[PDB]
mmCIF file of C-alpha atoms and ligand atoms in Angstrom:
data_model
loop_
_atom_site.group_PDB
_atom_site.id
_atom_site.type_symbol
_atom_site.label_atom_id
_atom_site.label_comp_id
_atom_site.label_asym_id
_atom_site.label_seq_id
_atom_site.Cartn_x
_atom_site.Cartn_y
_atom_site.Cartn_z
ATOM 1 C CA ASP A 430 -21.118 5.644 -10.789
ATOM 2 C CA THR A 431 -17.353 5.484 -10.890
ATOM 3 C CA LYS A 432 -15.019 2.610 -11.641
ATOM 4 C CA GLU A 433 -14.130 2.372 -7.880
ATOM 5 C CA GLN A 434 -17.717 2.050 -7.047
ATOM 6 C CA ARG A 435 -18.036 -0.627 -9.629
ATOM 7 C CA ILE A 436 -15.113 -2.534 -8.206
ATOM 8 C CA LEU A 437 -16.639 -2.474 -4.715
ATOM 9 C CA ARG A 438 -20.042 -3.519 -6.114
ATOM 10 C CA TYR A 439 -18.442 -6.384 -8.004
ATOM 11 C CA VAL A 440 -16.619 -7.514 -4.793
ATOM 12 C CA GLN A 441 -19.751 -7.393 -2.813
ATOM 13 C CA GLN A 442 -21.695 -9.538 -5.270
ATOM 14 C CA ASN A 443 -18.846 -11.906 -6.239
ATOM 15 C CA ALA A 444 -16.986 -12.539 -3.041
ATOM 16 C CA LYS A 445 -17.802 -14.087 0.437
ATOM 17 C CA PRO A 446 -18.037 -11.714 3.333
ATOM 18 C CA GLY A 447 -15.230 -12.151 5.769
ATOM 19 C CA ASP A 448 -13.028 -13.991 3.227
ATOM 20 C CA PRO A 449 -10.218 -11.694 2.229
ATOM 21 C CA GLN A 450 -8.815 -14.066 -0.389
ATOM 22 C CA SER A 451 -12.109 -14.074 -2.209
ATOM 23 C CA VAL A 452 -12.037 -10.344 -2.116
ATOM 24 C CA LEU A 453 -8.735 -10.077 -3.793
ATOM 25 C CA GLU A 454 -9.702 -12.646 -6.297
ATOM 26 C CA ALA A 455 -12.887 -10.670 -7.177
ATOM 27 C CA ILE A 456 -10.870 -7.446 -7.531
ATOM 28 C CA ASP A 457 -8.309 -9.089 -9.938
ATOM 29 C CA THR A 458 -10.983 -10.797 -11.908
ATOM 30 C CA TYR A 459 -12.855 -7.498 -12.489
ATOM 31 C CA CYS A 460 -9.759 -5.512 -13.340
ATOM 32 C CA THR A 461 -8.466 -8.190 -15.795
ATOM 33 C CA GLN A 462 -11.839 -8.800 -17.480
ATOM 34 C CA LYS A 463 -13.790 -5.573 -17.095
ATOM 35 C CA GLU A 464 -11.799 -2.352 -16.192
ATOM 36 C CA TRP A 465 -8.049 -1.712 -15.512
ATOM 37 C CA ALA A 466 -7.532 -0.111 -12.140
ATOM 38 C CA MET A 467 -4.380 0.862 -10.259
ATOM 39 C CA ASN A 468 -4.528 -1.794 -7.582
ATOM 40 C CA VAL A 469 -1.085 -3.453 -6.823
ATOM 41 C CA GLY A 470 -2.467 -6.692 -8.496
ATOM 42 C CA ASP A 471 -1.715 -10.256 -8.102
ATOM 43 C CA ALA A 472 1.917 -10.371 -9.508
ATOM 44 C CA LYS A 473 3.279 -7.589 -7.279
ATOM 45 C CA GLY A 474 0.914 -8.763 -4.563
ATOM 46 C CA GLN A 475 2.519 -12.103 -4.215
ATOM 47 C CA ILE A 476 5.864 -10.331 -3.653
ATOM 48 C CA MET A 477 4.214 -8.238 -0.962
ATOM 49 C CA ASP A 478 2.791 -11.369 0.640
ATOM 50 C CA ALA A 479 6.304 -12.854 0.845
ATOM 51 C CA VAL A 480 7.850 -9.637 2.398
ATOM 52 C CA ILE A 481 5.047 -9.364 5.004
ATOM 53 C CA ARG A 482 5.410 -13.021 5.887
ATOM 54 C CA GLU A 483 9.187 -12.630 6.341
ATOM 55 C CA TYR A 484 8.946 -9.628 8.555
ATOM 56 C CA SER A 485 5.536 -10.141 10.402
ATOM 57 C CA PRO A 486 5.354 -6.355 11.069
ATOM 58 C CA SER A 487 3.274 -5.254 14.105
ATOM 59 C CA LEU A 488 2.602 -1.837 12.792
ATOM 60 C CA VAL A 489 2.397 -0.975 9.099
ATOM 61 C CA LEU A 490 1.859 2.375 7.497
ATOM 62 C CA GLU A 491 0.457 2.359 3.984
ATOM 63 C CA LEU A 492 0.572 5.548 1.846
ATOM 64 C CA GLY A 493 -2.162 5.462 -0.886
ATOM 65 C CA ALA A 494 -5.063 3.018 -0.119
ATOM 66 C CA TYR A 495 -6.957 3.435 -3.497
ATOM 67 C CA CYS A 496 -9.714 0.819 -3.124
ATOM 68 C CA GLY A 497 -8.119 -1.199 -0.288
ATOM 69 C CA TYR A 498 -6.744 -3.999 -2.370
ATOM 70 C CA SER A 499 -3.271 -3.744 -0.781
ATOM 71 C CA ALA A 500 -4.621 -3.139 2.713
ATOM 72 C CA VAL A 501 -6.668 -6.317 2.342
ATOM 73 C CA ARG A 502 -3.733 -8.091 1.068
ATOM 74 C CA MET A 503 -1.380 -6.949 3.989
ATOM 75 C CA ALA A 504 -4.005 -7.046 6.734
ATOM 76 C CA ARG A 505 -5.059 -10.590 6.058
ATOM 77 C CA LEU A 506 -1.477 -11.789 6.756
ATOM 78 C CA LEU A 507 -0.975 -9.639 9.918
ATOM 79 C CA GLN A 508 -0.703 -11.619 13.228
ATOM 80 C CA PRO A 509 -3.362 -11.044 15.868
ATOM 81 C CA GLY A 510 -3.113 -7.651 17.390
ATOM 82 C CA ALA A 511 -0.904 -6.213 14.652
ATOM 83 C CA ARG A 512 -2.235 -3.123 12.849
ATOM 84 C CA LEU A 513 -2.258 -1.258 9.515
ATOM 85 C CA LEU A 514 -2.800 2.477 9.132
ATOM 86 C CA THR A 515 -3.433 3.535 5.591
ATOM 87 C CA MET A 516 -3.714 7.084 4.072
ATOM 88 C CA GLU A 517 -5.823 8.057 1.153
ATOM 89 C CA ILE A 518 -6.095 11.585 -0.224
ATOM 90 C CA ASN A 519 -9.414 10.992 -2.329
ATOM 91 C CA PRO A 520 -12.388 11.005 0.003
ATOM 92 C CA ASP A 521 -14.452 8.870 -2.309
ATOM 93 C CA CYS A 522 -11.654 6.243 -2.491
ATOM 94 C CA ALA A 523 -11.209 6.438 1.288
ATOM 95 C CA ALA A 524 -14.989 5.525 1.747
ATOM 96 C CA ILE A 525 -14.481 2.701 -0.720
ATOM 97 C CA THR A 526 -11.468 1.291 1.114
ATOM 98 C CA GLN A 527 -13.368 1.460 4.441
ATOM 99 C CA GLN A 528 -16.163 -0.488 2.796
ATOM 100 C CA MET A 529 -13.772 -2.927 1.098
ATOM 101 C CA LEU A 530 -12.156 -3.744 4.559
ATOM 102 C CA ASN A 531 -15.580 -4.069 6.270
ATOM 103 C CA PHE A 532 -16.629 -6.471 3.570
ATOM 104 C CA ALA A 533 -13.322 -8.482 3.985
ATOM 105 C CA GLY A 534 -13.925 -8.526 7.807
ATOM 106 C CA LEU A 535 -10.426 -6.652 8.435
ATOM 107 C CA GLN A 536 -11.944 -3.503 9.839
ATOM 108 C CA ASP A 537 -10.560 -4.136 13.347
ATOM 109 C CA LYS A 538 -6.984 -4.402 11.993
ATOM 110 C CA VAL A 539 -7.054 -1.335 9.766
ATOM 111 C CA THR A 540 -7.475 2.433 10.292
ATOM 112 C CA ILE A 541 -8.222 4.293 6.991
ATOM 113 C CA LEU A 542 -7.297 7.898 7.207
ATOM 114 C CA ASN A 543 -8.512 10.420 4.634
ATOM 115 C CA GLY A 544 -5.963 13.208 3.867
ATOM 116 C CA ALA A 545 -2.490 14.042 2.184
ATOM 117 C CA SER A 546 0.480 12.307 3.460
ATOM 118 C CA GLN A 547 2.365 15.511 4.070
ATOM 119 C CA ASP A 548 -0.341 16.661 6.439
ATOM 120 C CA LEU A 549 -1.074 13.377 8.092
ATOM 121 C CA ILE A 550 2.606 12.023 8.633
ATOM 122 C CA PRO A 551 3.359 14.727 11.145
ATOM 123 C CA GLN A 552 0.267 13.727 13.252
ATOM 124 C CA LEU A 553 1.085 10.067 13.515
ATOM 125 C CA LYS A 554 2.999 10.318 16.893
ATOM 126 C CA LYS A 555 0.750 12.526 18.924
ATOM 127 C CA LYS A 556 -2.664 11.790 17.350
ATOM 128 C CA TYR A 557 -2.421 8.053 16.441
ATOM 129 C CA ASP A 558 -0.026 7.218 19.251
ATOM 130 C CA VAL A 559 2.690 5.794 16.922
ATOM 131 C CA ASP A 560 6.240 5.312 18.287
ATOM 132 C CA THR A 561 8.050 3.848 15.260
ATOM 133 C CA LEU A 562 6.829 1.939 12.234
ATOM 134 C CA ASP A 563 7.853 -1.537 11.341
ATOM 135 C CA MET A 564 7.075 -1.261 7.755
ATOM 136 C CA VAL A 565 5.832 1.343 5.223
ATOM 137 C CA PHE A 566 4.159 0.556 1.834
ATOM 138 C CA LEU A 567 4.524 3.490 -0.643
ATOM 139 C CA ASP A 568 1.834 3.610 -3.148
ATOM 140 C CA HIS A 569 0.680 7.117 -3.452
ATOM 141 C CA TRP A 570 1.838 10.021 -5.665
ATOM 142 C CA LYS A 571 5.072 9.017 -7.117
ATOM 143 C CA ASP A 572 6.571 12.524 -6.679
ATOM 144 C CA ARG A 573 6.049 12.045 -2.975
ATOM 145 C CA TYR A 574 7.974 8.936 -2.326
ATOM 146 C CA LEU A 575 11.224 10.759 -1.607
ATOM 147 C CA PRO A 576 9.756 13.691 0.289
ATOM 148 C CA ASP A 577 7.714 11.516 2.525
ATOM 149 C CA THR A 578 10.538 9.145 3.220
ATOM 150 C CA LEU A 579 12.586 12.162 4.371
ATOM 151 C CA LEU A 580 9.583 13.409 6.442
ATOM 152 C CA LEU A 581 9.063 10.053 8.030
ATOM 153 C CA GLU A 582 12.697 10.248 9.163
ATOM 154 C CA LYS A 583 12.435 13.749 10.401
ATOM 155 C CA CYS A 584 9.404 12.836 12.519
ATOM 156 C CA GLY A 585 11.259 10.079 14.127
ATOM 157 C CA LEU A 586 8.905 7.371 12.807
ATOM 158 C CA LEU A 587 11.706 5.086 11.390
ATOM 159 C CA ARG A 588 13.786 2.795 13.459
ATOM 160 C CA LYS A 589 16.718 0.418 12.574
ATOM 161 C CA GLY A 590 15.193 -2.259 10.449
ATOM 162 C CA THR A 591 12.027 -0.439 9.357
ATOM 163 C CA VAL A 592 11.027 -1.951 5.932
ATOM 164 C CA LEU A 593 10.148 0.472 2.995
ATOM 165 C CA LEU A 594 8.298 -1.319 0.280
ATOM 166 C CA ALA A 595 7.631 0.964 -2.705
ATOM 167 C CA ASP A 596 5.241 0.110 -5.644
ATOM 168 C CA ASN A 597 5.619 1.456 -9.148
ATOM 169 C CA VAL A 598 9.337 2.237 -9.050
ATOM 170 C CA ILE A 599 9.598 1.400 -12.713
ATOM 171 C CA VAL A 600 6.006 2.350 -14.142
ATOM 172 C CA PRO A 601 5.050 5.133 -13.520
ATOM 173 C CA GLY A 602 8.546 5.282 -11.963
ATOM 174 C CA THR A 603 10.080 7.020 -8.908
ATOM 175 C CA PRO A 604 13.442 7.959 -10.154
ATOM 176 C CA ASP A 605 14.461 10.402 -7.407
ATOM 177 C CA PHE A 606 13.403 8.002 -4.604
ATOM 178 C CA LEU A 607 15.315 5.146 -6.234
ATOM 179 C CA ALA A 608 18.592 7.099 -6.753
ATOM 180 C CA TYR A 609 18.268 8.309 -3.223
ATOM 181 C CA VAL A 610 17.738 5.131 -1.383
ATOM 182 C CA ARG A 611 20.151 3.152 -3.562
ATOM 183 C CA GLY A 612 22.832 5.642 -2.965
ATOM 184 C CA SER A 613 22.309 6.227 0.747
ATOM 185 C CA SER A 614 24.307 4.407 3.484
ATOM 186 C CA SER A 615 21.023 4.701 5.576
ATOM 187 C CA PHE A 616 19.177 2.150 3.343
ATOM 188 C CA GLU A 617 19.786 -1.354 2.229
ATOM 189 C CA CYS A 618 17.929 -1.891 -0.950
ATOM 190 C CA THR A 619 16.621 -4.846 -3.028
ATOM 191 C CA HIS A 620 14.744 -4.705 -6.298
ATOM 192 C CA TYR A 621 11.969 -7.258 -7.059
ATOM 193 C CA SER A 622 11.253 -7.215 -10.785
ATOM 194 C CA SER A 623 7.553 -7.833 -11.707
ATOM 195 C CA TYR A 624 4.747 -6.546 -13.954
ATOM 196 C CA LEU A 625 2.403 -3.553 -13.766
ATOM 197 C CA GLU A 626 -0.942 -4.692 -12.468
ATOM 198 C CA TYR A 627 -2.940 -6.631 -15.015
ATOM 199 C CA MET A 628 -0.490 -5.726 -17.835
ATOM 200 C CA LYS A 629 2.351 -7.247 -19.652
ATOM 201 C CA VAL A 630 4.513 -4.274 -18.799
ATOM 202 C CA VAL A 631 7.596 -4.545 -16.622
ATOM 203 C CA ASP A 632 7.323 -2.778 -13.166
ATOM 204 C CA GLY A 633 8.851 -3.673 -9.787
ATOM 205 C CA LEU A 634 8.955 -3.088 -6.140
ATOM 206 C CA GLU A 635 11.895 -1.724 -4.164
ATOM 207 C CA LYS A 636 12.545 -2.820 -0.603
ATOM 208 C CA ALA A 637 14.683 -0.299 1.246
ATOM 209 C CA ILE A 638 15.600 -1.290 4.820
ATOM 210 C CA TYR A 639 16.326 1.773 7.029
ATOM 211 C CA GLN A 640 19.674 1.414 8.894
ATOM 212 C CA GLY A 641 19.601 4.513 11.224
ATOM 213 C CA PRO A 642 21.718 7.586 10.553
HETATM 214 C C1 LIG B 1023 -2.296 10.386 1.959
HETATM 215 C C2 LIG B 1023 -1.858 10.495 0.522
HETATM 216 C C3 LIG B 1023 -2.403 9.626 -0.391
HETATM 217 C C4 LIG B 1023 -2.236 9.665 -1.683
HETATM 218 C C5 LIG B 1023 -2.715 8.614 -2.549
HETATM 219 N N1 LIG B 1023 -3.814 7.927 -2.404
HETATM 220 N N2 LIG B 1023 -3.986 7.211 -3.331
HETATM 221 C C6 LIG B 1023 -3.056 7.361 -4.203
HETATM 222 C C7 LIG B 1023 -2.836 6.438 -5.544
HETATM 223 C C8 LIG B 1023 -1.442 6.796 -6.335
HETATM 224 N N3 LIG B 1023 -1.127 5.694 -7.408
HETATM 225 C C9 LIG B 1023 -0.869 5.961 -8.651
HETATM 226 O O1 LIG B 1023 -0.923 7.048 -9.184
HETATM 227 C C10 LIG B 1023 -0.567 4.728 -9.639
HETATM 228 C C11 LIG B 1023 -0.647 4.824 -10.893
HETATM 229 C C12 LIG B 1023 -0.416 3.822 -11.783
HETATM 230 C C13 LIG B 1023 -0.430 3.916 -13.206
HETATM 231 C C14 LIG B 1023 -1.258 4.793 -13.747
HETATM 232 C C15 LIG B 1023 -1.362 4.821 -15.280
HETATM 233 C C16 LIG B 1023 -0.538 4.098 -15.953
HETATM 234 F F1 LIG B 1023 -0.551 4.262 -17.388
HETATM 235 C C17 LIG B 1023 0.357 3.211 -15.436
HETATM 236 C C18 LIG B 1023 0.416 3.140 -14.001
HETATM 237 C C19 LIG B 1023 -0.189 2.581 -11.126
HETATM 238 C C20 LIG B 1023 -0.326 2.327 -9.796
HETATM 239 O O2 LIG B 1023 0.124 1.127 -9.369
HETATM 240 C C21 LIG B 1023 -0.283 3.433 -8.925
HETATM 241 O O3 LIG B 1023 -0.186 3.155 -7.617
HETATM 242 N N4 LIG B 1023 -2.211 8.205 -3.804
HETATM 243 C C22 LIG B 1023 -1.447 10.831 -2.143
HETATM 244 C C23 LIG B 1023 -0.940 11.710 -1.181
HETATM 245 N N5 LIG B 1023 -1.232 11.585 0.018
HETATM 246 CL CL1 LIG B 1024 -3.862 -1.433 -4.024
HETATM 247 CL CL1 LIG B 1025 -1.465 -8.647 -11.955
HETATM 248 MG MG1 LIG B 1026 0.724 1.473 -7.324
#
């Protein structure tokens, strides 16, 4: 089997159904002790939690679910009725994410879409009845952070105050995105320095709040 299947199995055998916190803990244990994986992790995850609590978004889009760690992290803090849409390009990982969310008891809050961000973003309004997004978590291909931000804007999915939160802006790094949002009058940016998941390597999150045209 694959690493991702092993992570799911470990959660199923070491966490409590319906207990998101136990799911996060199980994933972090496995990835610290057994096999590294590209989940956002606990260090950056704590920063994400603080942001989600500050903004209490009603509708969140995640780009790049992987195994569902971040989707569990965000969805467990959403208010009743609030929703997460998450996109995952790898079909095997999309299925793992669905199963992860099901185990965590968060499946009614989250819709996991299998496909590429460039294809799915233009369908959000008419197919998924999205008006505007309250928050976007960028965690997909690092080359796509900038084009997909621009595409979100083109599609009319951003409003004044939409929060973009970007993983991995240092490692692997997203230099074009960072330069762009930090240089743009349409964004108010803050950097949260942290560490790459499960590693003693500096990484960070960027928050970029959309200001309108
Ligand atoms: C809908 C759609 C979805 C996607 C999509 N789905 N899933 C992803 C995952 C992307 N993530 C990464 O590659 C990533 C890599 C590292 C890393 C690797 C190796 C190192 F040595 C150091 C760090 C660390 C991380 O935290 C990462 O997030 N993209 C893509 C396109 N369209
Ligand atoms: Cl993750
Ligand atoms: Cl960590
Ligand atoms: Mg990441």
